């Protein structure tokens, strides 16, 4: 099912729970993967109205269905907090520069 669309990529609630679980376990272990070092803090410069407390972390979510393991992160991210509550799914597709737009 298409529960969120980021650009032309569709992701399901399960796709999002899977991606977040991976991201949170690395957060907890205090290790990172890939050159841009994920998970990394999400600052919320954009000011999205998340309904979970900060701080937030971003972890890539991929349209191929695989869990990020370094390599190309694409434009999409699952965002979660320190308590492992999901905050939102965001993407760089449809925004200029390094900005983000929320997946809908
Ligand atoms: N637009 C934007 N980027 C952020 C924020 N917090 C961290 N970043 C990361 O900061 C980078 C630019 O300095 C953005 O591409 C993005 O990287 P990632 O997409 O790899 O997660 C934020 O609040 N807004
Ligand atoms: Na992708």
Curated annotation (Swiss-Prot):
The keyword Cell division does not apply. It catalyses: [RNA] containing guanosine + H2O = an [RNA fragment]-3'-guanosine-3'-phosphate + a 5'-hydroxy-ribonucleotide-3'-[RNA fragment]. Belongs to the ribonuclease N1/T1 family. It comes from Aspergillus oryzae (strain ATCC 42149 / RIB 40). Monomer. GO terms for cellular component: cell septum; hyphal tip. The active site is at 40, 58 (proton acceptor), 92 (proton donor). This is Guanyl-specific ribonuclease T1.
